[PDB]
Coordinates of C-alpha atoms in Angstrom, one line a residue:
Chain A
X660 CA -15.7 -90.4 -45.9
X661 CA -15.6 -87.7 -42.9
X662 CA -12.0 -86.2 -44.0
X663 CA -13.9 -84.5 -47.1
X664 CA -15.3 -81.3 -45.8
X665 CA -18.9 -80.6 -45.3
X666 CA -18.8 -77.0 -46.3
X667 CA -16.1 -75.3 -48.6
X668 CA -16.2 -71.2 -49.9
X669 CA -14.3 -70.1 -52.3
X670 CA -13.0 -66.0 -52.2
X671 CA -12.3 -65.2 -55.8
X672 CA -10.0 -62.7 -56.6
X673 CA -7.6 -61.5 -58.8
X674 CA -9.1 -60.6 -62.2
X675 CA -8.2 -57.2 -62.4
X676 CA -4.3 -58.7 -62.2
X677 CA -4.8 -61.7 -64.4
X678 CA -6.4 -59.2 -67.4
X679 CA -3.5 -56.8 -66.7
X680 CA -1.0 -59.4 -67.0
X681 CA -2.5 -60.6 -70.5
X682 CA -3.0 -57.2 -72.3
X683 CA -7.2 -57.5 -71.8
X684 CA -9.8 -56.3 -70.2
X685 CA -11.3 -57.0 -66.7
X686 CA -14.3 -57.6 -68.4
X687 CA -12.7 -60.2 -70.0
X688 CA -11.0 -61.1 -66.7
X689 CA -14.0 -61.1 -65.1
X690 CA -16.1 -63.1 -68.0
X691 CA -12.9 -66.1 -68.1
X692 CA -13.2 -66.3 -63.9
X693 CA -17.0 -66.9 -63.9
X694 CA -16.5 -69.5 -66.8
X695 CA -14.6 -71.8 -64.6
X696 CA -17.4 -71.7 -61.9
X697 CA -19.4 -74.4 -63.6
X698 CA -16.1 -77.1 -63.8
X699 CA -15.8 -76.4 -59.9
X700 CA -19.1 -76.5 -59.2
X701 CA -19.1 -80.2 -61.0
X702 CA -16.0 -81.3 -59.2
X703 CA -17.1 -80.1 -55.5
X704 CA -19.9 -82.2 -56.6
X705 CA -18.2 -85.3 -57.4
X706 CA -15.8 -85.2 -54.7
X707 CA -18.9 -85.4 -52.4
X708 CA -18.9 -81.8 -50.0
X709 CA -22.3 -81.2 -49.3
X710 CA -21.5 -77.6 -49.8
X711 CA -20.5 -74.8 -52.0
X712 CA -20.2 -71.5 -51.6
X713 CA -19.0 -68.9 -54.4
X714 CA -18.7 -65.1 -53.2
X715 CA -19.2 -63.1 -56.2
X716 CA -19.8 -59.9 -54.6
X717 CA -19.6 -57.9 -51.8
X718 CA -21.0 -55.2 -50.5
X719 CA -17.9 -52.7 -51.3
X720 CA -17.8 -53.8 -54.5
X721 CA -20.6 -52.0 -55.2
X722 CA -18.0 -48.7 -54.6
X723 CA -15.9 -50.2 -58.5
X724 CA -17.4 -48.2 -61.4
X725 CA -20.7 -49.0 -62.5
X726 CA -19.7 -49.9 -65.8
X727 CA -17.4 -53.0 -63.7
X728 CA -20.3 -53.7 -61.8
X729 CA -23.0 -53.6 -64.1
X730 CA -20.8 -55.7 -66.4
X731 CA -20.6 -58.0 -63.6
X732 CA -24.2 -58.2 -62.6
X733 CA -24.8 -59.3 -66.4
X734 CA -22.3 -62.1 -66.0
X735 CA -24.2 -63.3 -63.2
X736 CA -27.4 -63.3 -65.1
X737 CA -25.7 -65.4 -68.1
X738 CA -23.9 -67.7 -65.5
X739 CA -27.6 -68.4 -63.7
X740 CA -29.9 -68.9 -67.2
X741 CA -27.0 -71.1 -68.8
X742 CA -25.2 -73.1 -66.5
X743 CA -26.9 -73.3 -63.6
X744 CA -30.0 -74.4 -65.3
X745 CA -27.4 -77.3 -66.4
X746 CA -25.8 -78.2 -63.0
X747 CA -29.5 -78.3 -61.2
X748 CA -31.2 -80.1 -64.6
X749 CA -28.0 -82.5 -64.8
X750 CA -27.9 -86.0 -63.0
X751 CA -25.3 -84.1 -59.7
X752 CA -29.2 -82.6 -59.0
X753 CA -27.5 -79.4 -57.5
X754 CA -29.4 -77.3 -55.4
X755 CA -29.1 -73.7 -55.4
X756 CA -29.6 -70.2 -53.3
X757 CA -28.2 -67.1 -53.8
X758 CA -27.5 -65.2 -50.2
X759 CA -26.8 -61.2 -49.8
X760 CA -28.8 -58.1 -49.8
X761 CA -30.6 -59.2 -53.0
X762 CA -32.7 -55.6 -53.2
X763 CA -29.5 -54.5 -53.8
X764 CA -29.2 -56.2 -57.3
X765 CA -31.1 -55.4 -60.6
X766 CA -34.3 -57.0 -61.0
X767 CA -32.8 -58.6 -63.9
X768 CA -30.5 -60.5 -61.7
X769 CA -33.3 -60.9 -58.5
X770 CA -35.1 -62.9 -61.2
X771 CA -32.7 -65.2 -62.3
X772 CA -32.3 -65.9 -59.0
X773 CA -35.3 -66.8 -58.2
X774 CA -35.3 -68.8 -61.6
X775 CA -32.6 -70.7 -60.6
X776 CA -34.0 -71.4 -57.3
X777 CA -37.4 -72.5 -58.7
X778 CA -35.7 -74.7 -60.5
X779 CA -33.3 -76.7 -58.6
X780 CA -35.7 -76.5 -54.8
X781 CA -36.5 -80.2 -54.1
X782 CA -33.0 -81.2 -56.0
X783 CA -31.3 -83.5 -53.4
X784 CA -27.4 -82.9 -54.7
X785 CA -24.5 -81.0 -53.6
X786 CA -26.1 -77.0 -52.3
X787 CA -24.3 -74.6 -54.3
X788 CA -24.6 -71.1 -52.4
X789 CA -23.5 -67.7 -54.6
X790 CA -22.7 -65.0 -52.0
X791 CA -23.9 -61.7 -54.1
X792 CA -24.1 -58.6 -52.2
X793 CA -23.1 -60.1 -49.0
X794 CA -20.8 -59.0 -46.3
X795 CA -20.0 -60.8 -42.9
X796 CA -20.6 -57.8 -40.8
X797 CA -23.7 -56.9 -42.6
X798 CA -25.0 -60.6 -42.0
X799 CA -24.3 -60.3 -38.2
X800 CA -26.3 -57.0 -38.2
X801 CA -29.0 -58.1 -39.8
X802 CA -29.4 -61.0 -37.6
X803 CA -29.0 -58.6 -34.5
X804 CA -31.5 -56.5 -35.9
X805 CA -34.1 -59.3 -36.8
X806 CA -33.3 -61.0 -32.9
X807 CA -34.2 -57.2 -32.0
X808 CA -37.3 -56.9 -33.5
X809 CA -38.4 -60.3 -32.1
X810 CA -37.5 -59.3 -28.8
X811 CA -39.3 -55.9 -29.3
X812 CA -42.8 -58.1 -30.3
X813 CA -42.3 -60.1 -27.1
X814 CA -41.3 -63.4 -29.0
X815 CA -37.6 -63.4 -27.6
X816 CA -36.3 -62.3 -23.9
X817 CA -32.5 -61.0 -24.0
X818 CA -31.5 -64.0 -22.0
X819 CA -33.1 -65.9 -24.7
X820 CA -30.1 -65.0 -27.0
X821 CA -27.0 -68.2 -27.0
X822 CA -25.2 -68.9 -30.6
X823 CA -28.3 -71.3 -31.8
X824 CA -30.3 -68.7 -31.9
X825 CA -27.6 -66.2 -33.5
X826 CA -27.2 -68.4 -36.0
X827 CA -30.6 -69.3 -36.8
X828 CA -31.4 -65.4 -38.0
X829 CA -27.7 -65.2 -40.0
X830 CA -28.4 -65.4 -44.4
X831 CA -26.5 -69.3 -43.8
X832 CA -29.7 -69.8 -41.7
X833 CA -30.2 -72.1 -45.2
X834 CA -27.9 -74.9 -44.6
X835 CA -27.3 -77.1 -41.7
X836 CA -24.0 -76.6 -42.7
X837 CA -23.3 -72.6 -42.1
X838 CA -19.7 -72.8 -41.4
X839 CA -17.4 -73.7 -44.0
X840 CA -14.9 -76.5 -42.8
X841 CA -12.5 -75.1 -45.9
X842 CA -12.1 -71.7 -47.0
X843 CA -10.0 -70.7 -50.2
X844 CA -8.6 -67.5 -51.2
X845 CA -7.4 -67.1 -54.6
X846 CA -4.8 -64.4 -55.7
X847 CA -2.5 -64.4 -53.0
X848 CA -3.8 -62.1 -50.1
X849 CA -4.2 -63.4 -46.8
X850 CA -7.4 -61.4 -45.0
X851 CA -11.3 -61.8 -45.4
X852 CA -12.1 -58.8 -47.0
X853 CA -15.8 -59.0 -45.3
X854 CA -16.9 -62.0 -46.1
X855 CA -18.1 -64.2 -43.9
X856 CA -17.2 -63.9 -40.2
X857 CA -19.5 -65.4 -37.6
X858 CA -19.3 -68.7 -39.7
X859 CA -15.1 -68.5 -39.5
X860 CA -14.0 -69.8 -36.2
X861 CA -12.8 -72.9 -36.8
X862 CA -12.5 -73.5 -40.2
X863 CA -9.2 -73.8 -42.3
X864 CA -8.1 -71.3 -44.6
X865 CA -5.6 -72.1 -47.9
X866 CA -4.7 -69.3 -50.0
X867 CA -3.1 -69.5 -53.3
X868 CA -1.0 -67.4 -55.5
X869 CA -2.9 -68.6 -58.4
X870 CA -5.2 -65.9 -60.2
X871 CA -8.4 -67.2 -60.2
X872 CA -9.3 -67.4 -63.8
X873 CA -6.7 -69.6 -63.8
X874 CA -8.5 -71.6 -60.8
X875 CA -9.2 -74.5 -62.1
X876 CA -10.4 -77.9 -60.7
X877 CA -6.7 -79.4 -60.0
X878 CA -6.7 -76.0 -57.4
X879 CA -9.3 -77.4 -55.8
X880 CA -8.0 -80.7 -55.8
X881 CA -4.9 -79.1 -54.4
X882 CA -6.8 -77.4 -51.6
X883 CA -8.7 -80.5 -50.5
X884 CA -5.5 -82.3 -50.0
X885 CA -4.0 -79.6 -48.1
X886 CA -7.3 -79.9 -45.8
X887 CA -6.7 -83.5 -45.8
X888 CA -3.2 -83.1 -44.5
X889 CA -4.0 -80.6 -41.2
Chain B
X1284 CA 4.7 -43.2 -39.9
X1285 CA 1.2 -45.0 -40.9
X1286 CA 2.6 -48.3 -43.0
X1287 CA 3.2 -49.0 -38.8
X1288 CA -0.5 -51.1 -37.9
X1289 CA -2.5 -49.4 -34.8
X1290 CA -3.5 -52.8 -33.9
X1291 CA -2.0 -56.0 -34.0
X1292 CA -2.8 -59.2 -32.0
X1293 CA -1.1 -62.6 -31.7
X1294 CA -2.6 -66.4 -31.9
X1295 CA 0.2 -68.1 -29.6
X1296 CA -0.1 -71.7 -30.0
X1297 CA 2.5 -74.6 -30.0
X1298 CA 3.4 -74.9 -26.3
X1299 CA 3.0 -78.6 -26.1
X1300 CA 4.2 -79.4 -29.5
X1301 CA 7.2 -77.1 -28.6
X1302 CA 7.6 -78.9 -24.7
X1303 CA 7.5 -82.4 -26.5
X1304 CA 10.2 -81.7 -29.1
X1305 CA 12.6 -80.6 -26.4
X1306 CA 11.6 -83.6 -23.9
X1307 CA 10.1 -81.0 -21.6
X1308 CA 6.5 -80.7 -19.7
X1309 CA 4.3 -78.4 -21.2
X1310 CA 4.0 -76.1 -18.0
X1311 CA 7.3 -75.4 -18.9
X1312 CA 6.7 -74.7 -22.3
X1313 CA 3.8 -72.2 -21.3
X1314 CA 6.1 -70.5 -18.4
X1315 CA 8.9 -70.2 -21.5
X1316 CA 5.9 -69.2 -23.7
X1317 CA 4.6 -66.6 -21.1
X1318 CA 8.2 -65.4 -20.7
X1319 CA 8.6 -63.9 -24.1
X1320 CA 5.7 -61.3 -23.8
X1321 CA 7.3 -58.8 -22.1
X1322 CA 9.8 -58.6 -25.1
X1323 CA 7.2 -58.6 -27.7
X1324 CA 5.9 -56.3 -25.8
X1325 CA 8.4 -53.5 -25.5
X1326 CA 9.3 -53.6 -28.9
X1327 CA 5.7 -53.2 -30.4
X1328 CA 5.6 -50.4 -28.2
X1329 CA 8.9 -49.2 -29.2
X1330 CA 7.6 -49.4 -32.9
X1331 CA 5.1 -47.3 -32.4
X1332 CA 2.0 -49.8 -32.3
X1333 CA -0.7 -48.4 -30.3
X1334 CA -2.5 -51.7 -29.4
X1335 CA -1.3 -55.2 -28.9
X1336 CA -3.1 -58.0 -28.0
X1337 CA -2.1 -61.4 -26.9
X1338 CA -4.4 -64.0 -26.7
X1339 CA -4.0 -65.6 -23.7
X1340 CA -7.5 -67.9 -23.2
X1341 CA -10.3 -69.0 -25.0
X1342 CA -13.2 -70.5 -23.3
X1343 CA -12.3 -73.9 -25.2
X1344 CA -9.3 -74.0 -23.6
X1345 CA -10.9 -74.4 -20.7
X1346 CA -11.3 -78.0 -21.6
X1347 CA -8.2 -78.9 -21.1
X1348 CA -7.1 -80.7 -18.1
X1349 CA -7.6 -79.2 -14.6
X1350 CA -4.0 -79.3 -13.7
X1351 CA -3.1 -77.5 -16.9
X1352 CA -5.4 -74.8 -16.9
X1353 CA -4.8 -74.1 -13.0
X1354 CA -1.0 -74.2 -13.7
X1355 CA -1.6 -71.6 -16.5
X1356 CA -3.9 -69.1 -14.4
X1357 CA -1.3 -69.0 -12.1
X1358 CA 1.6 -68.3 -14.9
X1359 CA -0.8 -65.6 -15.9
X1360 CA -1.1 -64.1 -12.3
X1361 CA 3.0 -64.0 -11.8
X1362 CA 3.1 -62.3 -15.2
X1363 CA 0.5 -59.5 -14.0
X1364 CA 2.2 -59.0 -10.4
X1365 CA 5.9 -59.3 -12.0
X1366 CA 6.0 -58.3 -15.8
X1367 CA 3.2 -56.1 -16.1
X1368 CA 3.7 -54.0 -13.4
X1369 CA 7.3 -53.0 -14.8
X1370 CA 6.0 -52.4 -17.9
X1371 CA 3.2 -49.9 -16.9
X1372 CA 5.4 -48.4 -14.5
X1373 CA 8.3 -47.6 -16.8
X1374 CA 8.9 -45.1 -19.1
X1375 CA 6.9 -47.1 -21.9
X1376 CA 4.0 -46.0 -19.6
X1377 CA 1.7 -49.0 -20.8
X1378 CA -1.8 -48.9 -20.2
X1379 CA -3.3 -52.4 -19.4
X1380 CA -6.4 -54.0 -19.8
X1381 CA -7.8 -57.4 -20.2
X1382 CA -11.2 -58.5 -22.1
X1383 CA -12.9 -61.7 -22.4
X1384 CA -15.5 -63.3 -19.5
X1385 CA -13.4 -62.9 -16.3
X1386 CA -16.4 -64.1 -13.9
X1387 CA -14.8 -67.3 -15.2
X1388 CA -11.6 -67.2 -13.7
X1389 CA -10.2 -67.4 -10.3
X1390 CA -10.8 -65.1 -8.1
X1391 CA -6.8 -64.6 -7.6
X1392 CA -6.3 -64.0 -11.4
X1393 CA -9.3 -61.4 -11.6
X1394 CA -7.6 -59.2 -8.5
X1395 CA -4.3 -59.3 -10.3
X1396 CA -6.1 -58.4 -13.3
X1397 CA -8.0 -55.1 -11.6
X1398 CA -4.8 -54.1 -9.8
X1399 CA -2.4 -54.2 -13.4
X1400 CA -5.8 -52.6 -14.9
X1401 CA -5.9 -49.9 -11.7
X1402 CA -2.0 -49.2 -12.1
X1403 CA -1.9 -48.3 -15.5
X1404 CA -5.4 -46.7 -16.1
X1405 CA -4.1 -43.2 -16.8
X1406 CA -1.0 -44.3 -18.7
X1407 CA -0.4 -42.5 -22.2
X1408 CA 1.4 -45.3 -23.9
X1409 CA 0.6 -48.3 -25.9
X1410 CA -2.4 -50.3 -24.7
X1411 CA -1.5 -54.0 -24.0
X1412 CA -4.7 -56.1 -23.9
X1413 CA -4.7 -59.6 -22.4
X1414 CA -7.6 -61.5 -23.8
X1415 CA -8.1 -64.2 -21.4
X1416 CA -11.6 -66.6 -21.6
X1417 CA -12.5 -64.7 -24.6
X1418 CA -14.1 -65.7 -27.5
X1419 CA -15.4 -64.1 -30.6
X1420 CA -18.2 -65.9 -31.3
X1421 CA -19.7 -65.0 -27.2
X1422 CA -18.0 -61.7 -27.8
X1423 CA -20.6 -61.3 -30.6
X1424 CA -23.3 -62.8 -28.1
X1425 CA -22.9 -61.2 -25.5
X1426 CA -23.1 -57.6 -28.1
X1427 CA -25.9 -59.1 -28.8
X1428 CA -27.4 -59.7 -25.7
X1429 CA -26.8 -56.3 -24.4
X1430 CA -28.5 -54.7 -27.7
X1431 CA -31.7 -56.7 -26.8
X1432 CA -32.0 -55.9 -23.2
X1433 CA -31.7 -51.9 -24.3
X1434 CA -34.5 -52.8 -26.8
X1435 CA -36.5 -53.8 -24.2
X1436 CA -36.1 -51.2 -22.2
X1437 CA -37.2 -48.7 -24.7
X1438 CA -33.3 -46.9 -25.1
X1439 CA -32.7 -48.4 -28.5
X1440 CA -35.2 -49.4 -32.2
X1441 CA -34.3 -52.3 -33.8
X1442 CA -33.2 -50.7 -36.7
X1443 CA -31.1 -48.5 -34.9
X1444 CA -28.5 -51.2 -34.7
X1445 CA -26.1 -50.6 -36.9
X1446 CA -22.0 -51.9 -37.2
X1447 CA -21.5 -48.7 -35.1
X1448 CA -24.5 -49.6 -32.5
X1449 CA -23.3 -52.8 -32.5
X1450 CA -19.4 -52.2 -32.2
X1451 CA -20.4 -50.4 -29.4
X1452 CA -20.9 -53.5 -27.0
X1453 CA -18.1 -55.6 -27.6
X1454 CA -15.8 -56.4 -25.2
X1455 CA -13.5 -54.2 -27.8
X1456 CA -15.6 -51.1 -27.1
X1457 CA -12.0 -50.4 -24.7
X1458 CA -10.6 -49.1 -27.6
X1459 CA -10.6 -46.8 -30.4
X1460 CA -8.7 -49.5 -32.5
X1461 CA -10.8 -52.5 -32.1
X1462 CA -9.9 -54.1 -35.6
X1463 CA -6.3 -55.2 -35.8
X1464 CA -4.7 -54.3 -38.7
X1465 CA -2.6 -57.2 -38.5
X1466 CA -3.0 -61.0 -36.9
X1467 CA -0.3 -62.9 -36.5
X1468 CA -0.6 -66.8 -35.4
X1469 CA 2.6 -68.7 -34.2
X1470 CA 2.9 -72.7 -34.8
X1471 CA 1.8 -73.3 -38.6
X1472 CA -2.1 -73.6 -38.3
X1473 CA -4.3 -71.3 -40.6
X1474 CA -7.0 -70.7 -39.0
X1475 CA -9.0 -68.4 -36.1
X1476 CA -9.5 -71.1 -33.6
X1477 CA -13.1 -68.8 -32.3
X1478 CA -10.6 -65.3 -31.9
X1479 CA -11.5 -62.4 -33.0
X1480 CA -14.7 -62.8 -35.8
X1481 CA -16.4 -59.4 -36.1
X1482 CA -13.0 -57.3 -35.8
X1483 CA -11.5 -59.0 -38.5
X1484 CA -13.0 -58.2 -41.8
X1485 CA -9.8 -56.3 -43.6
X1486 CA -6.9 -57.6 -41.3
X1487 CA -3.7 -59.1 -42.5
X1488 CA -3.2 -62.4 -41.6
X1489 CA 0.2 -64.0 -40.8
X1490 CA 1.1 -67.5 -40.2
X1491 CA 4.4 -68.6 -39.4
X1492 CA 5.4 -72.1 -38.7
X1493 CA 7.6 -71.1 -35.3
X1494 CA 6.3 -72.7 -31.8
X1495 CA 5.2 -69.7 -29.4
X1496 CA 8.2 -70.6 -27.2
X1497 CA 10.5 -69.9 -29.8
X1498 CA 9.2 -66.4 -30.8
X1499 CA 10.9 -63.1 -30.0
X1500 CA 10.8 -59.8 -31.1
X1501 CA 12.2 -60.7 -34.2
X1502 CA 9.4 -62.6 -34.9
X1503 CA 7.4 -59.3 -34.6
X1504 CA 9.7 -57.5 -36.7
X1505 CA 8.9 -60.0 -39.9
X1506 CA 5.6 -60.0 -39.8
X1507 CA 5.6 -56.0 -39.4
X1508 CA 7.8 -56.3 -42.2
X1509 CA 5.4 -58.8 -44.3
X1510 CA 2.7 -56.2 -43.4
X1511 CA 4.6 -53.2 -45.3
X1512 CA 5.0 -55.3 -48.4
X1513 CA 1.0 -55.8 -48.7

């Protein structure tokens, strides 16, 4: 069917709130959000969206403490040797990328990556992007500086520069399908925060009170039928 | 006070939907539309907003029919020779400008844009932009554009671009407050319709299900009003 969007992202938030709430730790939070990745992962899947994308981290997020963030970066690391080897070894044949300054991250967690990316690179299921150290304006900038450089070398005349090509030199440069058709926010605020922003223009946002490790698959269920309804 | 946004701009949408409900043609639900500015716009400036912008034209729109995009220039060119010139000329002592590709429009509407521009250019109160045939994803372009001519010319390195270098050549580079703090979009639909992309990275969004036509300054007043409570 067409109604089922090509692209949906997901902007996870609330764990902080969610530990608060139950006398725990954001570790803990943190550790319970990541777990339901896999179930919504699977689900996305057999709905049939060609496209996932997950954004664990931004940019800013690298200004929590670095006992948060390293945390974090180690609950990446278990997510991609544990279930992502199963979703891309499974019969749903995910395929997966990581997008965002990667340099950024521990080699620890550059490796898994690259792992994971080994491993699932002529899978022909459902792309599953995780967003990790990426930020909309810093995508935009580093496509204007890569068109810049090309343009320097002789390859590209100003004139030369139209959406296409602004899009071919953005970090969703790996899909065909760059802008999400659905994007959901979990934990009740209504802004961007920095994610993605060339890839927004007409897509449709749902937000959600719900805290996301709470956010299960019915959530998604719920914001595919909203989609379905606009 | 600073809980008041420096910049907040409007998504008006639900003319036709608004014209058909009350058996009406929709150039009279754009000329009742067009009507209410003036209002929204005194009181943002009686608030203490320092930038307002109304989105009045996106290069889509210029698919529409003929009739209905002539009729709406010329709605737009009463509004700059009536309304805006009372509103720069009183004591609010608004300063006007409009952004977006105006090569595109008549050459009728561009002359009453440079003369509301040209009457107001040394005002000291709020600035009112009209963003008519813009776009943010040829806003970003066009940045983008102008970046790689100075390249080639020698003025700037690629990595010199950075989100100040780059900020720089919008068509926001007018102001001091190019981000708005808060969006607000009349006529239920969640989403950015090619607006504002690169501004928008931390702004408050808020929807409300009222038809343009509808909304007043009271309108205004609850979604300032949502804003505090974020």
């Amino acid at each position: 069917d067409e109604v089922t969007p090509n692209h949906v992202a997901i902007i996870i938030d609330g764990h902080r709130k969610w530990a608060k709430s139950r006398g725990v730790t954001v570790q803990e939070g943190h550790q319970t959000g990541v777990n339901n990745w896999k179930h919504i992962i699977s689900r996305a899947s057999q709905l049939g969206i060609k496209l996932l994308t997950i954004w664990a981290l931004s940019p800013q997020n690298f200004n929590r403490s670095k006992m948060e963030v390293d945390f974090l970066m180690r609950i990446y690391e278990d997510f991609l040797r544990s279930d992502v080897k199963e979703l891309v070894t499974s019969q749903q044949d995910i395929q997966f990328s990581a997008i965002g300054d990667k340099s950024r991250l521990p080699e620890y967690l550059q490796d898994a990556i690259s792992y994971a990316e080994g491993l699932s690179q002529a899978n022909k299921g459902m792309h599953f992007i995780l967003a990790v150290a990426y930020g909309g304006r810093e995508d935009i900038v580093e496509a204007a500086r890569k068109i810049a450089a090309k343009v320097e070398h002789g390859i590209l005349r100003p004139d030369d520069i139209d959406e296409a090509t602004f899009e071919q030199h953005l970090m969703t440069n790996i899909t065909k399908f760059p802008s999400p058709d659905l994007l959901i926010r979990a934990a009740g605020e209504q802004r961007l925060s920095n994610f993605f922003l060339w890839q927004l223009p007409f897509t449709e946002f749902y937000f959600t009170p719900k805290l996301f490790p709470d956010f299960g698959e019915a959530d998604l269920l719920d914001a595919l039928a909203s989609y379905r309804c606009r």
